[PDB]
């Protein structure tokens, strides 16, 4: 989570940015703090570009705008003047990405320890199938390269999270000598 103050002088008749939300009617539905949605490539806002739209103005013109209704936010900008020295908070970039790995079957199996699905989601709150242990010189070890920490949401087109640890386990082993597994990175890091 990043934080810092900045001055946005009215390039002319305004800064140029779209906001929405309010401590009463959150723009997302779970954040009393207001944030911006987009900036117009014209006003001083886009020119100053000292912040992102999805940020959270921790403070504006020395006014409490961390969890106040929209009307109060509009009033803050209404009495902002021109050179608004506001303090915003922009969270770091996420980390949600879907990978595609190749894992070949082996005589002793695929050579890896994974657990997901209902009944045994492995993780205390995640039906997704995550890995926990890998053998040496295994099929997935060398090919898959899925070190302890990866999580597969589906093998090519399988539902490794729509049955149970048993069905997902049987569905993973039921794969072919050479199957592509769909892995995913921990969103929001």
């Amino acid at each position: 989570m990043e934080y810092e103050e900045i001055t946005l002088e009215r390039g002319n008749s305004g800064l140029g940015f779209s906001i929405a939300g309010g401590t009463d009617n959150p723009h997302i539905g779970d954040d009393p703090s207001i944030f911006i949605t987009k900036i117009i490539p014209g006003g001083a806002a886009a020119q100053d570009g000292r912040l992102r739209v999805n940020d959270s103005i921790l403070f504006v013109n020395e006014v409490d705008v961390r969890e106040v209704t929209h009307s109060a936010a509009v009033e803050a900008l209404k009495e902002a003047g021109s050179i608004v020295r506001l303090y915003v908070m922009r969270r770091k970039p996420p980390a949600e990405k879907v990978m595609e790995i190749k894992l070949i079957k082996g005589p002793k199996g695929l050579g890896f320890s994974i657990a997901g699905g209902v009944g045994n989601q492995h993780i205390p709150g995640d039906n997704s199938i995550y890995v926990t242990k890998i053998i040496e010189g295994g099929a997935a070890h060398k090919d898959g390269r899925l070190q302890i920490g990866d999580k597969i949401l589906a093998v090519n087109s399988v539902g490794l999270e729509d049955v149970m640890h048993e069905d997902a386990v049987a569905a993973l082993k039921n794969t072919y000598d050479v199957v592509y597994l769909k892995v995913a990175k921990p969103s929001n890091a």
Partner: peptide
């Protein structure tokens, strides 16, 4: 939502 819209300022 329905009546209130974004503030472009």
């Amino acid at each position: 939502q329905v009546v209130p819209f974004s503030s472009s300022v």
